[PDB]
Structure formats: C-alpha cells, structure tokens
Amino acid sequence: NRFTVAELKQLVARPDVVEMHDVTAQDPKLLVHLKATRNSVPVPRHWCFKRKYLQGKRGIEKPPFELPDFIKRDIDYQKLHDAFFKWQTKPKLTIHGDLYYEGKEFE
Amino acid sequence: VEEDRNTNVYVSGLPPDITVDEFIQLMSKFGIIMRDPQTEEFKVKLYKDNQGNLKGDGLCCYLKRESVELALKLLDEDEIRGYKLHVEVAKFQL
Amino acid sequence: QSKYIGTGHADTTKWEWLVNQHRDSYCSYMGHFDLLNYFAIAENESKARVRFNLMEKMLQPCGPPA
Amino acid sequence: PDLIFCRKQAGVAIGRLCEKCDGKCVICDSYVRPCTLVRICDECNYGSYQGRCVICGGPGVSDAYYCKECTIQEKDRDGCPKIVNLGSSKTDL
Amino acid sequence: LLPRLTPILKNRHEKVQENCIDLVGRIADRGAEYVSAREWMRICFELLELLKAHKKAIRRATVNTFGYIAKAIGPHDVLATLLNNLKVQERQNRVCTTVAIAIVAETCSPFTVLPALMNEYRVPELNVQNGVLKSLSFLFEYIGE
RNA sequence: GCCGGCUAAGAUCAAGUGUAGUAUCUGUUCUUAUCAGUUUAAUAUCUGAU
Ligand SMILES: [Zn+2]
Numbered sequence: 423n424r425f426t427v428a429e430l431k432q433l434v435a436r437p438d439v440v441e442m443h444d445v446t447a448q449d450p451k452l453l454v455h456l457k458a459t460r461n462s463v464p465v466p467r468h469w470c471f472k473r474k475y476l477q478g479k480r481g482i483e484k485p486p487f488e489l490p491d492f493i494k495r496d497i498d499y500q501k502l503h504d505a506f507f508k509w510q511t512k513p514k515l516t517i518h519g520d521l522y523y524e525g526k527e528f529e
Numbered sequence: 530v531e532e533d534r535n536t537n538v539y540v541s542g543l544p545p546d547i548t549v550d551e552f553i554q555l556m557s558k559f560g561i562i563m564r565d566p567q568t569e570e571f572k573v574k575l576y577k578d579n580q581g582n583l584k585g586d587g588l589c590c591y592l593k594r595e596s597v598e599l600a601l602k603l604l605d606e607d608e609i610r611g612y613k614l615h616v617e618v619a620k621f622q623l
Numbered sequence: 624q625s626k627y628i629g630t631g632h633a634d635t636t637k638w639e640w641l642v643n644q645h646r647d648s649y650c651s652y653m654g655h656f657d658l659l660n661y662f663a664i665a666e667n668e669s670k671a672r673v674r675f676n677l678m679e680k681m682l683q684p685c686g687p688p689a
Numbered sequence: 690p691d692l693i694f695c696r697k698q699a700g701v702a703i704g705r706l707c708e709k710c711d712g713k714c715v716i717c718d719s720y721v722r723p724c725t726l727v728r729i730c731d732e733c734n735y736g737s738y739q740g741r742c743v744i745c746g747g748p749g750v751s752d753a754y755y756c757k758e759c760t761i762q763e764k765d766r767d768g769c770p771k772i773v774n775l776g777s778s779k780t781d782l
Numbered sequence: 783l784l785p786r787l788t789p790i791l792k793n794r795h796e797k798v799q800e801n802c803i804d805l806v807g808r809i810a811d812r813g814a815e816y817v818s819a820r821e822w823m824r825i826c827f828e829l830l831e832l833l834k835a836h837k838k839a840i841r842r843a844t845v846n847t848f849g850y851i852a853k854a855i856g857p858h859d860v861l862a863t864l865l866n867n868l869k870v871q872e873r874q875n876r877v878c879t880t881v882a883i884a885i886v887a888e889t890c891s892p893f894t895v896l897p898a899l900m901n902e903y904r905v906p907e908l909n910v911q912n913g914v915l916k917s918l919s920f921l922f923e924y925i926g927e
Numbered sequence: 928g929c930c931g932g933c934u935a936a937g938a939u940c941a942a943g944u945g946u947a948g949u950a951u952c953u954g955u956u957c958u959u960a961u962c963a964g965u966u967u968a969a970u971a972u973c974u975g976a977u
C-alpha cells in the first residue's frame with residue numbers, strides 16, 4: 423500500500439541519502455524532500471537501536487575528564503588570570519552537526 | 530599497617546555536662562551519620578558512661594576521610610558552652 | 624481556540640503543515656514593513672493592493688482541496 | 690509532579706506570594722534574579738481570591754515575579770500564571 | 783564583638799537572625815579583617831544552613847554577608863571548605879552549600895572556583911561528579927553575564 | 928568484559944519492600960514450530976486455525 427524501496431528511491435532526485443526504514447512512513451516523498459536539506463543534521467544513530475547507546479560498550483576504559491592546560495598550565499594573583507584568561511587554548515571540537523553516536527569517540 | 534586515611538576523630542576538652550545530642554549535632558557539622566549498627570559512638574566514661582560523666586575524651590566517626598580531615602583542620606579548639614576543645618586523629622587514646 | 628494553533632502533531636499531514644506555514648508566513652508579510660515594502664516594489668502595486676491580495680490568499684492557499 | 694496553571698487573559702492584577710513561596714518565580718520556580726512582576730486573570734482576584742499567593746495559594750506577603758531565565762524565554766507572556774490544576778482547583782482543601 | 787555576636791546568629795528568631803546576618807556582614811565591610819580565619823570559617827559553616835530559610839529576607843542577608851566573608855577570608859580556603867562540605871550534609875540541605883560555591887563565583891573572579899572545581903571532577907565517584915555538575919548548574923545560572 | 932564464542936545483549940508473569948514521585952529484590956517461562964488478521968518504521972505483541 424506504499425511505494426517500494428526502489429520506486430520511492432528512483433522517483434526522488436537525491437537517493438544518495440535514502441534510508442530503507444524511511445520508505446515505510448506516511449509520506450515518503452515529503453521525508454525524502456526534507457532530508458535533502460542544504461546543510462541540516464539528520465536523526466541520531468539511536469533511532470532503532472535498543473541498547474540506548476550505553477549498555478553495549480558499558481565497559482568504558484579511559485580517564486573521566488583530563489584537566490585542560492588552558493587553565494592549569496591566595497591561589498594566584500599574577501599567574502591565575504595570566505594562565506587561564508591569558509595562556510588559554512581554544513577547544514577544537516566538531517563544528518555544526520556531528521551528532522553523538524553510540525561510541526562516537528573510539529571510532 | 531594503615532597510617533593515613535583515618536576515620537576516627539578524638540575530641541578532647543569537653544565539659545562533663547555535655548550530652549549525646551550535642552555531640553551528634555557537632556559531628557553533623559562535618560559529616561552525615563555513622564549509625565551503622567544502631568547509631569554512632571560517644572564518649573567512654575568510667576562506668577561505661579553510666580556513673581561518671583565523661584573521661585575528657587570523645588570519639589567521632591565519619592563516612593569519608595576528607596570530611597574528618599576538614600573537621601580536624603577547621604573545628605580545632607572549637608568553643609562549646611563549657612570550654613574550648615581540641616581535635617586529634619589518634620592521640621594514643623582508643 | 625488558542626491552545627496550540629499554528630502547528631500540528633505526530634501525524635500532521637504535509638499539506639496541513641504547509642497550510643499553516645503559508646498562513647503564518649503572510650502575517651509576517653501584512654505586518655512586517657521591509658517584507659511588505661519589498662513586495663510592493665516587485666509586483667509594482669500599492670500597500671493596500673498587496674495587503675488585500677495577501678489577505679484574500681489566506682482563505683486556502685498552497686493549493687486547497689476545498 | 691507536573692503543576693498546571695490557569696493561563697487565562699492576563700488582566701491588570703499584580704501577583705503575590707506567601708512568606709515561604711515569595712522568592713521563586715510562579716513558573717520558573719527559581720530564586721535567581723527576578724526580572725519582571727507576575728500577574729493574574731479576572732478569576733484570580735475576586736472576593737476571597739483577593740491577595741493570595743500564586744504558589745502557596747494562601748496569604749500574600751509580596752509581589753509575584755518571574756525568573757530572569759523565565760522572562761527572557763518569553764514565558765511570562767502566557768496566560769494567568771496562577772498555579773491551579775485538577776487537584777489545586779477552586780474546590781480544594 | 784565578633785565572638786559576642788557569633789552565638790547570636792545561632793538563634794532561631796526571625797528578626798534577630800535577620801539583623802545579626804547584616805551585622806556580621808557589615809562587620810567585614812570597611813576593614814573586614816578583624817577576625818581569625820577559623821572564626822570566619824565557622825561563621826560561614828553556620829550560616830550555610832540558613833541560605834534557604836522560609837523568610838526571603840534572611841536568604842538575601844545570608845548571600846549579602848557571605849560575599850564579603852569569602853572576599854575577606856580567601857578564595858582557596860572557602861572553595862576547599864565548600865568542596866569538603868559537599869559530601870556531608872546529605873541532600874535535604876546540601877544544594878544550599880552549592881549555592882554558597884556560586885556565591886564565591888559571585889564574590890570572586892571566575893577563575894577562583896573554576897580551576898579548583900575542575901579538579902573535583904577527576905575523582906571517579908558517581909555522586910561526586912554528580913554534585914560537581916549540580917553545583918556548576920547553579921554557578922552558570924547565577925554567574926550572570 | 929576475555930581470547931566468532933563461551934546464553935550477564937532483550938521482552939514478559941506472580942509475590943515482597945518502599946516513596947510525594949522514580950523505583951529495588953526473589954522465583955519463572957521465553958515461542959526452539961507454521962499459516963490468516965491487528966499492529967509495529969521493521970520486529971514484537973495479541974487475536975484464530977492447523
Ligand atoms: Zn506560597
């Protein structure tokens with residue numbers, strides 16, 4: 423009672439980001455058009471996974487939070503603000519749409 | 530064997546007219562509770578805290594060692610209604 | 624009346640979404656000044672003309688199954 | 690623990706609060722940096738409702754405000770912020 | 783006057799405590815030293831339980847006095863005391879202590895509690911990092927602009 | 928977690944404890960099977976026959 427995975431993937435003008443589970447929605451053409459946004463961000467990888475992205479790799483083996491050197495390298499007068507607010511390092515992380523996956527750090 | 534990380538605090542210089550509720554209130558300032566079997570320990574008098582008032586010493590326990598260290602560093606010579614009291618780790622007493 | 628008018632919910636049809644889209648996109652046209660003095664320069668019509676056109680288009684725009 | 694509100698036409702009535710529920714906002718429920726004053730509807734100050742707390746629902750001791758984190762979010766522009774629900778209705782103990 | 787006014791703050795009277803809080807605050811207003819560090823630390827530990835009283839006047843006076851108290855005592859000492867106080871005073875009045883940490887952020891520069899509280903997250907405890915996050919919440923909620 | 932697997936990967940029934948609320952623990956079964964309908968993004972589940 424709906425377009426097949428090939429008919430709903432060929433009628434659209436951008437099947438490069440087509441999904442098998444997306445073809446069974448109520449409006450496959452509308453979802454395909456919305457997914458064809460310029461620089462949007464799709465749904466995360468935990469849409470169908472039933473592990474909650476934390477039960478599978480529950481054995482995390484890494485430090486909790488490494489002390490950044492932007493602030494670590496009377497408490498201090500001429501070096502506290504001169505090392506944290508002066509010798510600060512810019513945190514270089516993802517820019518726009520790097521949605522966190524289950525692991526997202528090990529791979 | 531174990532030297533540091535002690536959870537036993539010895540409070541000395543307490544008046545004999547003190548009670549257990551006041552000791553619990555003073556211990557709550559740096560801890561939460563040590564009522565493992567029923568409750569927490571108290572001062573040891575001559576006749577098991579029955580005839581005498583107190584043998585100038587009281588024992589206090591805490592859940593963590595950092596809290597006990599902070600209490601010993603801050604509650605040193607704390608002034609209670611009768612007098613000033615000192616805090617120690619062991620003091621060669623109990 | 625004014626509970627949540629302006630957006631559907633979990634099974635909102637695409638047509639009923641675009642209808643609210645246009646119906647709330649013209650109010651920013653009849654009320655806003657830059658987007659109303661800019662459309663009267665393209666269509667080359669007065670403010671009242673373009674405003675009445677946009678108001679009459681609010682009956683059932685986007686392509687109505689009426 | 691999802692509290693409900695009146696959310697009617699915000700009249701020209703100022704807000705209030707109890708001696709214990711005076712600091713926190715009627716919606717944000719926070720004591721941090723009150724920004725604007727809360728209001729009520731016509732059915733919030735009428736006879737017995739004169740001078741009642743918007744959170745405690747009893748005596749008023751001050752004016753009901755909103756939190757700065759709740760007024761910048763345009764939450765104060767909603768209806769009557771009176772905390773009333775099926776349990777906290779007019780016929781309540 | 784400091785040791786004489788110290789037990790007065792322990793009273794349960796509403797107006798009496800409200801006046802004593804402002805008195806202790808103004809005591810450290812102009813000169814503000816006038817004390818041993820242990821006495822100021824004990825006064826702060828006693829007033830930390832009154833930061834969430836029923837009367838909002840006492841809650842405002844406590845925050846108005848604790849700022850000057852922490853500015854006169856010192857950033858590191860007050861920060862360490864508040865951090866050690868996080869584990870004690872179980873979660874019925876614990877959050878107020880976190881607010882006191884925010885008071886330090888409102889009383890001192892941002893790098894007075896940021897680098898000291900950052901090392902409090904390296905501990906692998908669950909309800910230690912949890913408390914650190916619960917404190918950073920109120921910190922960024924009351925730090926302002 | 929260890930060097931694809933060793934059934935700690937999921938759903939579900941009965942009872943106990945307890946909160947303002949969330950919950951926590953013990954004992955099961957798990958269709959090893961097929962078709963039709965409901966339903967699920969797909970499983971699952973349930974409804975009937977064999
Ligand atoms: Zn109230």
Ligand SMILES: [Zn+2]
Nearest residue numbers: 695730769771
């Ligand atoms: Zn109302």
